[PDB]
Each structure stands twice: as structure tokens, then as C-alpha cells.
Amino acid sequence: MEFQAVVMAVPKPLLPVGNKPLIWYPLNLLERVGFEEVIVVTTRDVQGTADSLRYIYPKLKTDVLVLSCDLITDVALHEVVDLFRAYDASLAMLMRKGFIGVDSTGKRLLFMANEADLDEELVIKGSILQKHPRIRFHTGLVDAHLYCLKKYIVDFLMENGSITSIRSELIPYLVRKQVRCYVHIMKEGLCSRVSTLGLYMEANRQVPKLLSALC
Amino acid sequence: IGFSRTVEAFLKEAARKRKFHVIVAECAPFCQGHEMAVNLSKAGIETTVMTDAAIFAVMSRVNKVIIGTKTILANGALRAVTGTHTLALAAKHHSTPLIVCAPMFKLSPQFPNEEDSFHKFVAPEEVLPFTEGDILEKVSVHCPVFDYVPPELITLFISNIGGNAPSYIYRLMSELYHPDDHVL
Amino acid sequence: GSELSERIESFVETLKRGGGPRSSEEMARETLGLLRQIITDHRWSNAGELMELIRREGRRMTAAQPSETTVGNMVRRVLKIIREEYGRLHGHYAQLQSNIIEAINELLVELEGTMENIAAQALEHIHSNEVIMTIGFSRTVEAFLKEAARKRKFHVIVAECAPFCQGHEMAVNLSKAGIETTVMTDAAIFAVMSRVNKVIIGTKTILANGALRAVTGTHTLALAAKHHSTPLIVCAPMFKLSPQFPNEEDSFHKFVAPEEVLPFTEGDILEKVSVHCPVFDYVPPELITLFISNIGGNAPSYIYRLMSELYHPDDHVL
Amino acid sequence: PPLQAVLVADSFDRRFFPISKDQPRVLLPLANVALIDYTLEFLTATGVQETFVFCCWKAAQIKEHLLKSKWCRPTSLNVVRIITSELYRSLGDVLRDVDAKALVRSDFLLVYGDVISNINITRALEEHRLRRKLEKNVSVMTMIFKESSPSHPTRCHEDNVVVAVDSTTNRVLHFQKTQGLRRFAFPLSLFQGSSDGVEVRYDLLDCHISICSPQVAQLFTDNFDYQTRDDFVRGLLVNNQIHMHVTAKEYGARVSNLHMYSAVCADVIRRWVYPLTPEANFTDSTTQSCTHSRHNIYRGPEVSLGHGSILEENVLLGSGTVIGSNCFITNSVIGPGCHIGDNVVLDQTYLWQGVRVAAGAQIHQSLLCDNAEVKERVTLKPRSVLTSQVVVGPNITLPEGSVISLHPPDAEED
Amino acid sequence: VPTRKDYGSKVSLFSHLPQYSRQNSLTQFMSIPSSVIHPAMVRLGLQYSQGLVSGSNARCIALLRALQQVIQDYTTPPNEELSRDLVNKLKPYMSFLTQCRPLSASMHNAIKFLNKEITSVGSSKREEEAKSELRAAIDRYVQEKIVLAAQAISRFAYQKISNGDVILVYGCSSLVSRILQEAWTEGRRFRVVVVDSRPWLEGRHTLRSLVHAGVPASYLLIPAASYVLPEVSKVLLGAHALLANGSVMSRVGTAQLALVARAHNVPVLVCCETYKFCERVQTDAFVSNELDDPDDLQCKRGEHVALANWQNHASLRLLNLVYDVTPPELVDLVITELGMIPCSSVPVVLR
Amino acid sequence: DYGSKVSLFSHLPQYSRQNSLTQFMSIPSSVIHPAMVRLGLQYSQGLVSGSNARCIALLRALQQVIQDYTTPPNEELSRDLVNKLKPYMSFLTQCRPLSASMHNAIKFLNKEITSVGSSKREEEAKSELRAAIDRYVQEKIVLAAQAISRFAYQKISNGDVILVYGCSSLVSRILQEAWTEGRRFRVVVVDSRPWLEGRHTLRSLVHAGVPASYLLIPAASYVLPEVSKVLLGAHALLANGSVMSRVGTAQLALVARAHNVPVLVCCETYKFCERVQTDAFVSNELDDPDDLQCKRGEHVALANWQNHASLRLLNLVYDVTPPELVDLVITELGMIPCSSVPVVLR
């Protein structure tokens, strides 16, 4: 029992993506490798993220692996889980190319600003640059919204319930600071999240090539 | 060198999983190395046969030496067949390991005394035949079967209790025999 | 001859700045050509003026780079040629120039032929299923090895050099010919120097006592060979043979920037730590087995005679 | 087209002040050898065929030192030309004057008279020309930077810079200093237009070596209030493109202040600027020959070393310098014609020509210029600089950072 | 659990030693929520494969902490004896860890000690008592074999180091670093000379440690050891294992340095504890060694890599050795927590 | 070739004694001279195995060939003879590999033939060649042993225990001449298989009256402690100072050095070759492998050794000794060190 699976779905998960349920692709991603248990937070009719996560705090008792309501990707979970295992990282995330301040080696996360917060320019501290004099900045990549998180991070989220939508509130605070955050960029994967109509149609068009290998 | 059942088993136990080249130096008085080479080649080990004179000129491409002995002395030395001293000298000159496959019963508490009864002298018929002529009356022929091998030329001792160094045989002796029964 | 002075200055600068040609054969050929040009385009009546001028020019060229023990040898050879010619003609002040040029050309052609003269002696020392190892990268040893790989088969092991990993090129060149070569570091010499049957290496200079000033790392190889009693052969032409002894010499090695040993991006520790990067080293004669020269093999104990034959005792100081 | 460079042998900035009053900055003996000699040797070794030496402050001494030097000989392949003028006030004025005279033709290098480097520029210059020939009249400058550590002693805060360039094609998008500032600001235009491969670099040492183009001088004439190079780059980046070339296996640094002076000296003595070392004698001079021995100890002719003294680390003794008995010198540079006493400890001290130190003196991390003198029982602290021709009485203990000069207002007078 | 796959062409002489590449991992074909292997064991194997934990004692410490975690998280099954439960459960974990990276002598000794202790567990005591006893014995061992032994070795070696001496170290050994630090702290005034070797370049660790301590350390490569030895007076070396025949199975570049030192008349000292003594023998580095990732041998010289594509040549082999053996006649004495003993006394301590 | 050779000795020819090369030849030999034919047959059958005996027989056969050699018209003889003698040497080598003595002798003969000008008559040239061969033999073989006999007489003392190995035409002569001068010593004769040629020296010494002993080489370490000197003979002296002799010489010198016994070597100046060698692997000679067969006990163990495809039979002849084990060398010029061979070659 190294990791526990959790996927929030707060319809969207019932969209027939390729004549199959949209929530079936995330669950299939959490399959074929152990994972005899997975926590879903869909509505009662389905047969914030921080709030829904803390609502089931006493249930989880080990490292958590949070996914998105719908996430179609043909990546190997080990690729992202190795960063959490080897380096004993506190945060491990996955994303694909189209702030982020990934370092030279391409794994350590240094900067996580957003365009809405910054005033006009990009401010950078002197110490973080003293330690790492090279900061590779990415702007066009897309966020798949899946993270491998430790347990003490969940405890910290619980002891203060003033955090909502960890994607934009917790990850920047974690990167801002020992904590260890890492990222994995494929540059050749699918990594499609169904949020708008364009991505929905792209996923509908890409389904056959994935289903040919899945089934 | 020579013919030793323990060394033969040690060699043929590795041939079933490894491939090596075994060189066998015969014994001039009693050419018993031929039997060992034949028994080894019977199992496909790529053996070789040669005389005792070709032990140094050929021992430049060799890497390891594994031989037996008649008995192991107290200071680490041993009593081996004739010609083993030259083999050990060549091994030490080329800095090659010299493994000695000998069981525990071959350990003698006696030390290297001046060793008059050390070598076994046999009839000179093997060295020089009786049909030579009239020169046998004024020619002294000696045929020592065994020889003394110092410990400095040895590198390891493989026994039924694990490999050890020559500098630790005294403890094995102390554990085996009582110091009062050394002279018997 | 201002053009001659310009050529001399350019040669001295390229030798003191970053060296001349990359290989030693081209260096010796260029030095001999420059000496021939100096002998041709210059005025003199007696041989003493010519020989002292050549002495001064060679002294300048050596002061430009003392570690390049290839130009002083050519200067001493030209001086010995001049002295032999003067002794033959006097034992003279009107036709001594042309004959010196002829002798220099005779020396040049054999300088070039040295490579084949050395490579032709590969089958005399290499046998089938042999295990030979080398260190560094040398054209002479490369030819000596790849010339016998057609009819003979053996295993080669190349040890790279830590400061400048030049053995990779040699390993690749040998693998392109199908010799079954292996690459390793210079820190695993003694670890593998127990299954080796022979060693062949190339040097940069041969001292008077039969010693070698080769790249850094060959002294340990020679020590390991002498410990394991493995014959170590050195293939070097005659122009790599200098009339100087190991001691009685300062600036024996060449010290280059520590960038190759310890990079500049370490930090503040570079102010305390002292780093040294020697390019060459010294190998005593007692660890050498044979010398493959253009005139055949020779033991390290017969180098003094070649010295007395090639150079003049009065021209050792230069 | 023969490669030509422009040498500004005068830094209108005055950081060595008080020292720059009696004797120019570019002729201060670093390792018994002037800085302009290092710069000229670098230019002559990199392939430069012609140089234009501009001098305003104390130009007579510069020229009359150069005319004896080996670069002005008829046998030198890098013909140098001294242009002296009293109007120059900044580098921008020098470039304006070049444009007025039409001296330069092609890609020229812009370097100061106090740059020490062994970098080869053939590679970077090819990159520059090829880049300009794929985009006609687009690329205008190429700044050479040496990647280092932000911890290195050579990286002073006064010259420390931070860049944000594109990794696809090396190109400067933002350039600013970090003198007295803790969090850096980078505008959003960088990500606004292009530069998918954009990254911030803080591990770079500004060698002040730039492969310029005639268009640089043209733009310098257009904008009258360009007083230096840094402002040229800032004013061009607000608006032509400026690129870089990074080196990792070569050395390069500019002597801008006193702290920077003692940093290159240790490196030069420690052979970090090979082939440029004291052992090489790259000036063809007779009074600078030495012999390199173990531990990077350099000894010249007529060293007169006394019995008992111990040379422990990278020291450089001059020709004619006299050492006493039972001394201890380490990491110290001694000039020619110096003369030491007895029981004299020198630790990271730079003694120029004509110095005499009496017995019982302990000097640590301080610099003694020409004709300096100290009496017995005198102890000098770190950064305790003495200028020309001062004499310090006996039994005096100078505080740290003390500066003594014979000019009244320069510092604490004699 | 699947078997790891080799990488590249091995040498004819080392055809019996496995050779893997750190680019590929064995967890690619295993579950993320590990079912057969414990999660801590998976993390430890990943750290070993990626080269994060490459220390002689650090690997053993990490293994012991992982074993403590495993014993804490595990519960014995019904109607099953406890003494064999842990042994049967650890049997595959050692297999996995060996597949990730060949275990060292210290790890083998620690595993043997833990198996001994587990077999020594009684049949009447409950689960909590035995688990607590094992968890306490593990750290008791760590204390009485690593830190206390290191303190004793440093106390014994302090008297050998004197003022004005020049010590020559090699590689990265925490014991030698601690010895030098304590010697410099106790008032000894000396200077060290660090010798490094490619491709690991781990001597810089001890270099920066000594610089942090304030010792006038020096740095150079192993091929130039013959140039600095004429001025060296002592050679301190670390040992990864000491066999029954009195041979040091330390880093590959240690036997060469010892040979050059003996040729230059420099007494060499070896620091090692009593928990690295194994009841096995090895006469040469060929019969038993480890082959690391060969892709680490290639380097960038100039602007092109000569070994960029070494697998294209069908007659090109890459040998990347790790350890090697040195004969007993090269080591003068071996410093241990039981007093200074010669190299001919390893069996005496093993007895 | 006959039989399967060794992997490390696969670059050398392994002939046989039963397989004769005269089968595919005319009884009156047309292409080859009858004298050279019988000489090669003797070499192959082992009738002449002595280092100096082989050279003497070769030179006498060459004299016989020259005596009945007719120079064709339309060409000079100074070159025709050299061009004709080459196939004879090739056939001799095919019969049995040549030795250093034979090589030097044929080289000297070729040089002498080339020194003959076409200005001279045929009969005069043949007579001069015969006289030259005769005097060269007398100088380098006959007179080259009388000076070595009186030089080694100084190093022989009363009560000495000299140890010899194999068979040598010079060692036996040295000992027999030193015994008659007044010295009273005893010799230890060492022999090895399968040639067992030391019995020749044993008999030659017994017939002279010198107390002699006989033992096999494996027991050399047992008798060396009582030995005072080791006098050995070799076939060639390489240019690198090394010595080329019988296979049982290098290890003998090694054991002598281990027992602290001074080793000596006696060789003629004409055996001073110009090549070099480092081991007995690059240039050796493999004789018939069936010589190792021995009637030990009731039957032979290597009677059908070829049935075992994995079994090889090595029968090396020569070996190379390093200069690190040779102390003194005796020649007609005088007592010289082991590292002075090139000086004599000069």
C-alpha cells in the first residue's frame, strides 16, 4: 500500500467520449498496475478540489495520488512515480508541452507564477538563483492536474482550511517554500484534458488510436 | 602438474559452466600427467600436454595455477612432487596466484627440519635405464620423488572449510593437533 | 632575408603559443625544412659562422618551448651533418652548401619512411591469440598494431588519459579495423594487468639513459608491468631520441591550466585548493623491455651508442 | 578582410583612485608585467591584424611604453596604432570618433586595455558572420561571456550581471546589473512575442570582449547619450539584435577595481591563463625571465635567496630582488629590485619594483607600489595599500583597509 | 519480478559479470502500488540504480532503515512460525536489490546479522515484543559497528598523524574524512593530497569537506600520482571489504595507488571496521567484480565526443570496473576499532 | 602439417617424422640437388641435430653442390648461383626449420658469392669459394673453441661442482680440456625428455675420467644447493642480450638465481644474430608430437591421443632467456657481460 488513488468529479464525467464514459479513462489509467482501490467523489446521480480532498481526510492514511475528473493519456505512471520514489519528493506532477520555472536538469520545479498575479514583469529572488543559476522557463505547456502528494502535506492542508483549488493555491505555495517538488514533461504524449469544445473534439478524434491498444 | 584427484574434480566442476584452457605438465620420472590430461579431455576441457622443461618458457600467457600436494608443513610450506618448486618459482616470478587444493588430513604439525628423509629416493631405473652400459658403475644417479616448497611462493590454500592463507595454517594445526603430540 | 626572419618568427610563435603540427613526424619535417631554408638563404664564408648561427637559432627555438623535444634533435642532427662534412672535406669554403642540402634531403626521405620501417616489424613480436594493451594515442603504435591485424588476431585494450581523453580516438580507429579492442579508464590498469601478455606504447622523447618522457600515466603502467613481469615495448623513431638525462634538467614536465583537472565552475574552494596538471612523466630504464626503432629492435642498455653515433658530444648543451 | 580591433587603453572610470593619479591604470604591474601587454598578447594570439589604441588620461606614458614594446616592432604581425586625444570622456565618444574617421571596416572587437584572456574568437566570429548572413543586417553584436560560479572570488558584485536569453539561438533579450539589489525583474515582452526556449542565466562572467559591427558605431553616433556599452545594450533592447557566445574551456576577466586585481593575479601565477604565464615570458623582455619549479614557485635571475627562508606556495620573485634569512613568503608576488630584511612574513602581498622592507615586518594581504618603504617593527593588515614613494615609521600598526599616499586628500597622508 | 536486461557488449574476460545501464529501470514492469516487493525496498532499489546512494556505509544504513520499516509495517500470517516468516519474506527483497545493483560486503554482513537475529527469535514471545527487540537490535548494531567503531578508529589513528606530515587520500571515504577532521581539530597541522579518478569524480566530496574544515588540501588525478608521491609521507586509504586472505576489495584505483606508493617508499594505511570482514576469498578482480553503466566513459573533449556511438562498431568494447583486489603484501597495517593490526590478522578478528 | 596444433602456437609449422618429403620426387632428383636432398632427409629424420653439426653438414653439402655447378651461358654466375641456392634453402627449411647458425652461414655464403666478380673465371671462383668456406669453418667453429677452452679454464677451480644441461659440443670440450690441465672437479649433467641428449655428454665425460652425475631437470632444485657453478650452452645470442637455447634452460637459470648460483654461457661469435626476441611464443619450433609417447608401466596413455579432439600435445624445442638471469658470456674475444652482444655485433 504505497499510494492511494483519489479522483474528484465535482454532466462532465458522463460525456460519451468515443461511445464510452469519460470517467472510464481515468479509472483505466489507474488500472493494469495493482490499484485495487480508487476514491471517486462524483455526485449522487453519477453511477473545490481542496474542500473535496479534506472532506475525506480521515479515510486516507497513506500517500495520495490525485487525478482529474477526465484525463486521457497513454503515459506510464512509473515515469512520474519514480520522481516521488527515488528523490523522496514531496510533490510529483505530470504535464505536456503546448510561467513554470523548471531547472536545467528538467525535473526540479523552481518557479510557478501566474500571469494574473504578476504586476507587469516577472520578479525572481536572489537566493534561489544563487543555488540554481539556470531556470528554464516554460509558458505554453498544459497542466494535466495530477499530483503525487505526501501525507504531511494533507495534514498541513487540514490544519488550515483557508486553501482552495490546490492547483492554483497549494502548488505555487509549495514551490515558493525540506520541501521537494518535481515535474515530468513528455513532449511526445497525448495528455488531453476535456475542458472546452476544442479539446473535447480532439479527444474524440484521438480515441480510436488509443482504444486500438487498450482493447 | 602431476595427477591429483582433488584438482581434477576442482577443474571438471567448473567446466560444466565455464570454458577454460587447462595446461598439464607431466612428471619426468613417472609420466602421470598424461593420465590426468586424458581423463580431463574426456570431458571436453581443451587440455594440453608438455614436458617439465617447458614450464617457464610457456608460463608467460598463464593466469592461474592450481596444484595439489602430498602434505602441508607447519610454516605453510608443503611437500609436493618433483618439479613443483620450479613451478612455484615461475609463478612468483610472473606474480601469478598459486592455489593449493588439499584436504585437512594433509596437514602435518612437523616443521621444516633439515629434511634428510623428506624426499623419497627410488631406483635410478626411471631416470637412467640399466641397459646404458659400463658407465653405470662410475655415475651416481639420484631420483627424488618429492621436493620442498616454501610458503612465500604460495598464495592460497583451499580446503573443505574455506580458503585460507599460508600465514593461518598454524591456527588450523593448533585446532587439529595437540602441541604435545607433535613428536609422537 | 626578411622573409626568412618572418618564417622563423611565425614558427617560434606557433611553437610557443600552441605548438606546430599535431603529429611529431610533421613537426620534425617542418623543423628540418626551416633549417634547410636557413642554410640556403644566408651568407657565410666559414662553417663556424653557419654552425654557430644554427646553434643560436636552435637555442631560440628550444627556449620558445623546452618540452618539445623534437626540434633540438633536428638542430643537433644538422650540426652533426655539417661537422661530418667539414671533417670529410678538410680531413671546403666554396662548395660546402650543396652537399649539406643533399644530406638534409637524404635525411628527410628516411624521416618519412620511418613509419613503414617501424610497421614492418609487427609480425616478429606479435603472435596469435595475444593480449596486448596500450595507453594514449600514437600514430606509430596505431600503425604497428593495425599492420599485423590482417594475418594475426589478438585482443587490444586502450586506457584513456584522465586530463585529455585521447585514447578514445585510438580505440575507435582500431575498432574500425576489426581488432576487437576494449576501452577502459587509466585507474583500472593494475586491476586488469594480470591477464595481459604484452604491452606496447608510444613515447614523446627518449632520454640518453634509455628513459622515456611519455604522457602522464605510463610510469604506473611500467611499474605494474615490472611487477607482473610483462614485456613492455616502446615504438618510437630515431628523431624522438634526445641526448639528455632524466635529472640535470628543470622544467621536465609540462603544466597546463587546471581547467582539465578541476573545472572553473566549482565555486570558492578554488581559492584554497592547489591543482596541478602534468602532461608528461618520467619512466626509468629498468622498466623497459625493448625499443623498436627504424634499425630493428634494441635493448634499453644500448642507447648510449646510438647517441654517440647520431649526435656530437659537444652539441649536447647546444 | 583582415580582422581589426579597437583598444580603449583608458578607463574613464576611476576605481583605483588614489593609485591612478601618478601612473595609468593600464600600466600597473600585475605579475611584473603591465596589463596592456596581456591585452595586446591576447589580441595578437586570437588573430587580430590591426589595433587602434585610444588614450586620454596620461597617454604620453602609455605610448612611450608601447613604442619600446615588442608589438610596435617591424617584425610584429599585429600593427598597432596609437590615437591620443584630450576630448574623450567615455567609450561612446571613442566610437563616435571612429565613425568620424572611418577607421573600421568589418566585424571588429571592442575590448578595454585591462582585459586578461586566452580565449580564441575564430568560432564566435564565424557564428556572428553566418548569423548576419542568414538575416541581413539583423545581428549587430556578439558579447562573449565565461560561465562561472556565483561563488567565485573573481565575480565581484560591481560587475555582476544577470541575463535572460533564448536557448534555441543564443540571443540577448534582457541584460541588467545586480549591484546592490536582491530580487530581479524581467519584463513580459520576452514571453509576449517569441522565445519559447527562454531561460535566465546567472552563471556568467562578463569578459568585456565584444565582436562589434560598423553599425554599432553608426548607432553610437545616432544616440548622443550612449556613454558606455551597457547603456547601448539597454537602449537597443528597449527597441537589431544582440547575441552571445559562451566559453567553458578558456579564461577571461577584466581588472575593474582593486579586489578584482588580486583575483586575476592568483590565477595568472597559478597557470589558469595558460599559455600566458610568467614562465613563458610572452613579452620577449630580458628582465622578466624566470624558471618554473614545483609548487608554482617562479625564480628569476639574481634572486639572492638567503639561507633559511621557505617558499611554501605560488610565489613569483623578480630579477634583482634580495631575500634575507629565515623568511616566510607564500602566495606573494615580488617585483624586480626589491630588498627584504630578516624575519619577514609575506602572505598574499604584491610588492612592485623598488620596494625595501625592513626586518621584523609582517605584511598580510596588502599591496606595496613602486619605491615603497617600511621601517622595523611595522605590521600591515589586510587591504592596507601603500602608494608610490611613501615611508612608514617604525613601530606602527596600520588598521585594516588603511590607505597611505603622499597626496594630501587621496588618503591618510604619510 | 522480471529480470533486468543487460546493455551493450561485455568484455571476453568479464563475460560472467552482469552489466546494466542506469538509463533503464526495473520498476517499469512492476506495479506502482508494489504488491510483491515492499515500497521501501522499491525506493531503495531505485536509489541504488540511479546512483543516489553510492557510499559504503550509507548503503548499509539505508538498507537497515528500510528493513526496520519493513519489520514495522509487516504482520505475521496465521498458524505460521515467526522465525522463518521474516527470512522467507526477505528472500525475494534481497534478490530484487541485487538485480538493481550488486550488494557490497557490508550489505551481505548486515543481512547475515539480521538473519542470525531473526533465527534467534523465540517461539513463545508475541509479535510486538519481537518486532521491538529487532528494531532495537538494528540500531544497536548501527551504533556499535559504524559510529562507535569510527570513533575508535579515529582515536587510534590520531597518534599516527603528526605535524608536518603529508597524507594522500583517494576517492570518497567518510571514515578517512572524519579521521582527518578530528586530527586537524585536535591540533595536528598537516596537509592532504586528494587523488581522484574518472568517471565518478567523487574525490571532490572529500576535497570540499576538507576545505570546509580548513585543511590545506590539494587535488590531482590518479595518473599523476607518481609525480606527487615523492613528497608524500603517508597514504590513508578506505576499504569496502576485507577478505579472509587479508586482501582489500576497495575501489578499483586503490591497488594501483598502493603499488605506486610501495614503489616510492610510502607506508600505506587502511581504515576498516570489523563488520566488513567476510568469510570469503578472492585472488583477482576478474573472478568477482561489478560492471557499472558503460555510457559514463564517454566525455566531451573539444567539441565532439569520440565515443558518441560506441555500439555501432561490432569490435569495440567498453570496460567500466568498480572494485579491485590488492595482495596482502602491499598494505602495511590496518587500523581497526580493536587496535592496529597487520594485514595478516583478518582471520584473527573474524574468529 | 601433422596433427592439431595449439591455439597459441598455430602460427608455426608442425611436421612429422614418418611423413617424408621425398615421396613426391624423382629418385634421381632433378629440381633439387642430391646432396641437398640427402641433407634435408637427414635433418628430417634427426640424423644430424647438433647446432654446429647441422651448419657443418650444410656447408659441406653446399661445397659439394658448388663443385658440380655449371654456369649457363647468357648470364653471370655471381647472380645465377645466388638465384639457384634459394630453392635449396627453401626445401631445407621445409624439411626442418633452420637455425641461427645456418642462417648466418648462408648469409655469409651469399655475401661471399656476391663479392665474386664476373671478371674472374669459373674454376677460380669455385676454388676460392671452397677455400673461403673451409677457412671460415676453421675460424668460426674450430679455432673459435680453443680460445673459449682457455678462457673458461680460469673460472674453473678445484673442488668445483659444475652443472650442465643437454648436449653441447663446446661445454664437453671445455670440461675435457680443463680436466687434463690439472683441475679436479665433478660435473652434474641435467637432462630432459624426450630427446634425452644429455646422455651424450654423460658418456663423453665418463670416457674422459671426470666424475659425473645424472638426474632429470625436475630435480634441479634439489641438487643446485650443492652446485657452485652452472655452465650452459646456447644456440644463438639475440641482440637484446637474451639467450636462445634448449627449452630447459630458462627455468634452470631461474632456479639457479633463486639458489644464488652464478650462471654462465658459452657461445661462438658466429652465432651472434641480429634479431631480437622476448619470449618463446613468437618464434619457436614444434617437432613431432608423438615423441611425448612413453611406455610407462603396462601401456601407453597417449597412444591414440588424436581421437580426443580437445587434447593437444606441445613439443617446444627452443626457448628465450631474459638477460636478468645471465651473468657472464664466454667468447673468443674474451669474457663479456650479457648486455654486450650488440658491441660484438658492431
Author numbering:
A (entry chain I): 1 to 10, 24 to 60, 85 to 135, 157 to 235, 297 to 334
B (entry chain C): 168 to 351
C (entry chain D): 8 to 98, 125 to 351
D (entry chain A): 41 to 279, 285 to 459
E (entry chain E): 167 to 517
F (entry chain F): 172 to 517
From the manuscript:
The integrated stress response (ISR) is a conserved eukaryotic stress response that senses and integrates diverse stressors and responds by reprogramming translation. Loading is catalyzed by the guanine nucleotide exchange factor (GEF) eIF2B, a large decameric and twofold symmetric enzyme that is composed of two copies each of five different subunits, eIF2Bα, β, δ, γ, and ε. The eIF2B decamer is built from two eIF2Bβδγε tetramers and one eIF2Bα2 homodimer. Upon ISR activation in response to a variety of stress conditions, eIF2 becomes phosphorylated, converting it from eIF2B’s substrate into an eIF2B inhibitor.
To this end, we prepared the apo-eIF2B decamer by combining eIF2Bβδγε tetramers and eIF2Bα2 and subjected the sample to cryo-EM imaging. After 2D and 3D classification, we generated a single consensus structure of the apo-eIF2B decamer at 2.8 Å resolution with most side chains clearly resolved. (E) Local resolution map of the apo eIF2B showing that the peripheral regions of the γ and α subunits are dynamic. Regions close to the core (chain D, on the left) are well-resolved and have clear density for most side chains; regions close to the periphery of the molecule (chains A and I, middle and right) are less well-resolved due to higher flexibility. In the apo versus the ISRIB-bound state, eIF2Bδ L179 shifts slightly into the pocket, occupying a position where it would clash with ISRIB binding, and eIF2Bβ H188 (a key ISRIB interactor) adopts a different rotamer. Overlay of the apo decamer with structures of eIF2B bound to one or two copies of its enzymatically engaged substrate eIF2 also revealed unremarkable changes. As indicated by the structure of the apo eIF2B decamer, the conformational equilibrium in the absence of ligand likely favors the A-State, which is further stabilized by substrate eIF2 and/or ISRIB binding but antagonized by eIF2-P binding.
